[PDB]
Amino acid sequence: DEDETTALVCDNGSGLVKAGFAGDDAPRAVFPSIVGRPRHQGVMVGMGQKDSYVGDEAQSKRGILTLKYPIEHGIITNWDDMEKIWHHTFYNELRVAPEEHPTLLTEAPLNPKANREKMTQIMFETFNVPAMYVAIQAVLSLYASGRTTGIVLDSGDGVTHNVPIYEGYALPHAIMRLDLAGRDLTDYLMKILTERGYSFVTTAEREIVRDIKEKLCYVALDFENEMATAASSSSLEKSYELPDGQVITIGNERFRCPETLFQPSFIGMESAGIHETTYNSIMKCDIDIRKDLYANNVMSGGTTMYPGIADRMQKEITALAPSTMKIKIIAPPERKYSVWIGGSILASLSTFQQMWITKQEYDEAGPSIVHRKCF
Amino acid sequence: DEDETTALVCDNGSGLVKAGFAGDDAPRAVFPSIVGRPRHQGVMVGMGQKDSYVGDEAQSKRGILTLKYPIEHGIITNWDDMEKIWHHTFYNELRVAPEEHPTLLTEAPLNPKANREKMTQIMFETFNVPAMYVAIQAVLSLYASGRTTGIVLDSGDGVTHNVPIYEGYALPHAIMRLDLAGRDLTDYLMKILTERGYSFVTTAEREIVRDIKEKLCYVALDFENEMATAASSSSLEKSYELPDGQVITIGNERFRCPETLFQPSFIGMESAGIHETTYNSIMKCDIDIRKDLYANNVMSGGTTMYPGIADRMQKEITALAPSTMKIKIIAPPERKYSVWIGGSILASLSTFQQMWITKQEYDEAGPSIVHRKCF
Amino acid sequence: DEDETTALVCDNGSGLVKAGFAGDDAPRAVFPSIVGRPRHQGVMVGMGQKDSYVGDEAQSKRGILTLKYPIEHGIITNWDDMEKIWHHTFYNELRVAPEEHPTLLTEAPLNPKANREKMTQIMFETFNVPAMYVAIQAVLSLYASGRTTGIVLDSGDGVTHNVPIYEGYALPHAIMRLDLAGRDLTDYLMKILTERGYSFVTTAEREIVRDIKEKLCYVALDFENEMATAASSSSLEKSYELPDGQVITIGNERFRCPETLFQPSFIGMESAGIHETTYNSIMKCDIDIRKDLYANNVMSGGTTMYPGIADRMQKEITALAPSTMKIKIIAPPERKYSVWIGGSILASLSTFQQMWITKQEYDEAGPSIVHRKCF
Amino acid sequence: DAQEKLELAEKKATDAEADVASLNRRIQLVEEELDRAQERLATALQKLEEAEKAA
Ligand SMILES: Nc1ncnc2c1ncn2[C@@H]1O[C@H](COP(=O)(O)OP(=O)(O)O)[C@@H](O)[C@H]1O
Ligand SMILES: Nc1ncnc2c1ncn2[C@@H]1O[C@H](COP(=O)(O)OP(=O)(O)O)[C@@H](O)[C@H]1O
Numbered sequence A, B, C: 001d002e003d004e005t006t007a008l009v010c011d012n013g014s015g016l017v018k019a020g021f022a023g024d025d026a027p028r029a030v031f032p033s034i035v036g037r038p039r040h041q042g043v044m045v046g047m048g049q050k051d052s053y054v055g056d057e058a059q060s061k062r063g064i065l066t067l068k069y070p071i072e073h074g075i076i077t078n079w080d081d082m083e084k085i086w087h088h089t090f091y092n093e094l095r096v097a098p099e100e101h102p103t104l105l106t107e108a109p110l111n112p113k114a115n116r117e118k119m120t121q122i123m124f125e126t127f128n129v130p131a132m133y134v135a136i137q138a139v140l141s142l143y144a145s146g147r148t149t150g151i152v153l154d155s156g157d158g159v160t161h162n163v164p165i166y167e168g169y170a171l172p173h174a175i176m177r178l179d180l181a182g183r184d185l186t187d188y189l190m191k192i193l194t195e196r197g198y199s200f201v202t203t204a205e206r207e208i209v210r211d212i213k214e215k216l217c218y219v220a221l222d223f224e225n226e227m228a229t230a231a232s233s234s235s236l237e238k239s240y241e242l243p244d245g246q247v248i249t250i251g252n253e254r255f256r257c258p259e260t261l262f263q264p265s266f267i268g269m270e271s272a273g274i275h276e277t278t279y280n281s282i283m284k285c286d287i288d289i290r291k292d293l294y295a296n297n298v299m300s301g302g303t304t305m306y307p308g309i310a311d312r313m314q315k316e317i318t319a320l321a322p323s324t325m326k327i328k329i330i331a332p333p334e335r336k337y338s339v340w341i342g343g344s345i346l347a348s349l350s351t352f353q354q355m356w357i358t359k360q361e362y363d364e365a366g367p368s369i370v371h372r373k374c375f
Numbered sequence D: 001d002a003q004e005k006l007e008l009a010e011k012k013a014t015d016a017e018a019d020v021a022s023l024n025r026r027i028q029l030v031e032e033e034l035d036r037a038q039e040r041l042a043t044a045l046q047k048l049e050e051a052e053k054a055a
């Protein structure tokens, strides 16, 4: 339905896919990274029932479906399901497809090599894209934030990367890969809500919990004070209506789940916590770099939407950082949608038009070309 | 359990602690420089379980422990964990109580002063050792190798000190200290194994990668040609059995890891490599010294056990060195254990019996005495 | 912006380049003698970013650059980097094209011939300067300091030249060129700051140590008594602010480094120190010269900017000198700038206009003409 | 509209705050240069006392 001869952009994780076309400042639509399948045998005639559901179809019908997510902590392994997700995304809902447009897909800086190779290959071989470019989420996070310099706290669905860039250059030894993201926070909340008498086991139930979390949970500027009160009084509880007519209230659990980011030990993870990983991405860089990264701590990805996270992360780093120097967190409304936006910026910059793999070079070289042309 | 009041020698690196008694040709036991602590909540009652595990205990029970190293880049910062390691090392496994034996410890000449001062203080005040002596790795390496003259390039776990000695004399203006060591080579390997689909981020995983490195990696005498085929075919891969039944193979990662010794830029360090630092330590010595140091290039420390390292280092110096001069590398099987062996040699030399600090002088002066009596 | 074809004047060392116009009393701009190069891989695009940075550009962007200088111990070995430094110096900060202005460059009296020859060639062939004149740094120091007679003690970044002049004439047999300089002091200080626990091994760190030295260090008059208290109490320590907000305190290191000038053995140099070396230049001169040189020891260059240096040198020289004789040191505020200033003076004097190599004589003879026309 | 006015007011606050901070940086840079000018003045005056004393 679109007639603008621009690039297309998609951010694909273990939870959601943000997508639209390059040159704008927002995705046109956001789809779940889901291929749904019926988990029941139909009995009655005229009950519909699809063999497969894609994206929002899978999420909307989830009460009777098993929901599969193709991306594992940042890597696409089920490329067949991503092809279905991308077809729906582009052809059915965004109303624009790669066949007539160059396409940019994103990944984390240390994401296994197979991910960028398959993203490049599927757009060229199943979507017939005229050109490709696999982007680094850290690059996109700073473009969308108005920075060339800063720490990218790309807290996604399956992984948080924690990666510094200075004057447009990578500082890779200072990357603190962390196995804690929005999907793990959802799983933890399912377990602590089970402790409150509301067990959540199935994937439809996981989606209910993700909705509860996104609307009711927060990290808190001061965890211990919120905890002591919330664990002692109903005045700190918040109600949510479950899609069966039950009402669930959440007290200190409302923040204990989100707290996992600062205390990963809550889910059995071996990690110093998001504020120390942020601190180390700054501290492991050279001393004439450190000061600029402290002043430019940039949030991207989701989980950045928890109340108290932009104020808390600044508090936790300034408390570890030396005095006089100003420590600042950048946390715009483009929060969680900023990687897509950065993709739009990179794809459309004139300074990037020589970075695209055309369907010339690709056909002669094959998918290994991504390591010659992208990064 | 010993029948003579010989000195004890304990080589406390940032990696492992080699220890035994003076006068021998090997440590009697090797312990990791580790104190381990549980990162899980106990479930069962009456299970024993320690608050902390020491040395080989820390590795034996590591499945649920986070393992910390008290020594960072060669310097002790956690003296409490050092005391635990030493007590275990000396009293439980080596069976030598320091109270009845003088003790020799080892360190780089540019290792910050707190290291030699704190080690001296602990052996005199918590172990009641009758005497102490903190020895220098360059001295210890030349004794172990049968030399009085040469360059000691200790490519150990912590920091590389690169120190030239001629006719038993230090040539300190020619010391090139490099912030590159075996621990960083391991970290590089973990990131590139992540690129191949094997993500190792927790302690058990880190200790495993170190073991994989030790058995599978090699330097290559031509990085680019070796990579051209390692990156193209399985014929240059080597397998390793992971503790859980899974397997891993390593391709160009097998040599890219040790390559950081020749290319420190791989981990973000501003350096041309261990062969340039070796070259400069020879070159910065007087002109009548240079010829003897070229012919006596001594490899020491661990990582000297990567296949091809002894030969590549001779090639790299020969390529920088003037013609006519003979360039030669010394690389005995007493590699990685050379600092401990040098300690054994030195502690027992008649020429060294006047170098010991007794526990008289120690109390009159305090631990700062190490800077006047040892080095 | 000038209303006359005044000569351009530049004083180019291994440290910094001071530049301006003849007839002024200070340089118009000072640059480090540095061309910087990025040591990191660019990740973002449309970031600007140069292949190389020059002078202050190299310093401002130093957090990610390796910084190299073209001048070693007083001689330019990398003319390409000096060409870039001069182009920037002349066209961007001095706002002048040398094509319309004659240029005065400087070198030490015993500096290898290639320096003055290459400098002459580049200014005539790449800048098309109408004339050239390579000055004696000692001459320039004497004019700026108000003397015709004395020992020029430049003690610069490269070398200490120690050159006696009487009635405006060289006494070359008595020049004690010494390989003891400001760049060795920077190296020594970082080794002793390493002893204190602060590692300085990268370029940014090296330049920071240079800045620490310049602001915190001194020689004083009595090393042993100063050390007796500096080594015993924090009351003689001074804090230096590192760029990331952290601090380093420096104690007896504050003077142990500067002490190298009186004790060169601290950096492995076979020398009696600057006070004895100054004395020897006087002693190698005739007795009817010596009386005027003793009374006129004159400081120039740099490192002569250490507190207590003019007063300690007078004490140390008078202690070697014959009795009755008056020993005095001239140490003007025109310190560190006096060689450049002398360049401005020599160029503005009418007594110097016949000394220029014209761009006629130059092309007929070639750059070797400098050895017939300058000194 | 409340939300756009809010994004604009929040932006105004963000930019105004970016400037509260840029102003505080300039204020501290200038106050620091001022204190330093005053430290250097006190020093210049002390060194003036040394120069007058020298006189
Ligand atoms: N209101 C919110 N509260 C808490 N967490 C959130 C909120 N919004 C987003 N997040 C988390 O972030 C995830 C989506 O963010 P996003 O970074 O765009 O994922 P991706 O990079 O894979 O596209 C969700 O799974 C959710 O767990
Ligand atoms: N075959 C091998 N391959 C690669 N690295 C090795 C090998 N053997 C030892 N090293 C490494 O050398 C380091 C040991 O340092 P070491 O010199 O023994 O310190 P210390 O003298 O105090 O014992 C560890 O990082 C270890 O992994």
Ligand SMILES: Nc1ncnc2c1ncn2[C@@H]1O[C@H](COP(=O)(O)OP(=O)(O)O)[C@@H](O)[C@H]1O
Residues within 6 Å of the ligand: C011, C012, C013, C014, C015, C016, C017, C018, C155, C156, C157, C182, C183, C210, C213, C214, C215, C217, C300, C301, C302, C303, C304, C305, C306, C336, C337, C339, C340
């Ligand atoms: N306060 C100071 N303390 C220590 N060293 C100094 C001080 N001031 C100048 N020097 C040193 O002197 C050198 C600069 O000398 P300079 O004469 O300006 O070089 P050039 O001869 O090329 O003009 C540098 O190494 C600088 O660090």
